[PDB]
């Protein structure tokens, strides 16, 4: 059951306004006390869902952006910096530009998601909060 056995290690960054997620180069990697400085590099992937609004019409919910370490997750094959709609790249300066084979993704049957936190002083676009 591959799709049910794989997930982001972190909770989502919810996009509350019209601005897409983006970070200054050097910022944006979630805090994880189980990782080392070498490991601090990956991407956020956008997910959007649709549900029936209170007036009968389908409507989009706010988009959710999920973080995956480089070389893991739904875009495991993408190199750092590859251009793709709904994918934005983050790295702490000095991180290893190598797939994070020792981290992988999360299995919900084994671990709950880590509440996504960012270092104090991180710049977030309007409509993003952490």
């Amino acid at each position, epitope marked *: 059951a591959n799709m049910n056995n794989t997930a982001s290690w972190f909770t989502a960054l919810t996009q509350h306004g019209k601005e897409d997620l983006k970070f200054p180069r050097g910022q944006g990697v979630p805090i994880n006390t189980n990782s080392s400085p070498d490991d601090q590099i990956g991407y956020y992937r956008r997910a959007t869902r649709r549900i029936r609004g209170g007036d009968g019409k389908m409507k989009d919910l706010s988009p959710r952006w999920y973080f995956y370490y480089l070389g893991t997750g739904p875009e*495991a094959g993408l190199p750092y910096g590859a251009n793709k709609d709904g994918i934005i790249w983050v790295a702490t300066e000095g991180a290893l530009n190598t797939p994070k084979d020792h981290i992988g993704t999360r299995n919900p049957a084994n671990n709950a998601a880590i509440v996504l936190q960012l270092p104090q002083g991180t710049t977030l676009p309007k409509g993003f909060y952490a």
Partner: antibody
Amino acid sequence: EVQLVQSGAEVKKPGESLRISCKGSGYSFSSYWISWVRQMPGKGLEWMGRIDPSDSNTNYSPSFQGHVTISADKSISTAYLQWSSLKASDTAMYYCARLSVRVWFGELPHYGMDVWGQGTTVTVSS
Amino acid sequence: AEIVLTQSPATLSLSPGERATLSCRASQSVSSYLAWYQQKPGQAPRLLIYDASNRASGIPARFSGSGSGTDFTLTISSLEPEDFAVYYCQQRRNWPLTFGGGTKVETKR
């Protein structure tokens, strides 16, 4: 200019130990790995192993594990390759190369072996 | 060992002015972690292309690389006399780092 300068040609006999060296200049030595590569006469390139000078973490090719030791003195930007017992079959050209792997913002990193030393020949014969 | 890189053909025989296409195939996927090197006679290897498709600084525009996964190509759009050399690929996807066996580009007659 970024450069790696290797030590001079060596002529040795079987069983002797040997250490050759590789000196970096014009860059932060600890911010990049060092890789060692062997080329037998007339033959192709073969990876021997690498060292991260920041914490001296090493890895070796399975073919060279236990026959050579890679080390580094980061305070003088020098990497080393050392044999405990040379064999006639170690007669070859040895290259060190900067192995760029980290994301640095002040330049466009050329991920891979982006700067090479000029090579050191080792001749092993009784 | 582990990820095996196979270069084709072993020798390419061409004349200056002609297009060269060099092949590298990996025994399992290396995503984009593949580099190309040139080694001229009597000289150290030189990086040409890093992570499959990026041209190194100082490298002439006639060199280009493409591919992902297991199939990679180095193209020399129009050969110059100084491009007759040996070309090696190398993957950095996983330990141990491995080289292909080399393709020699030599002069046809």
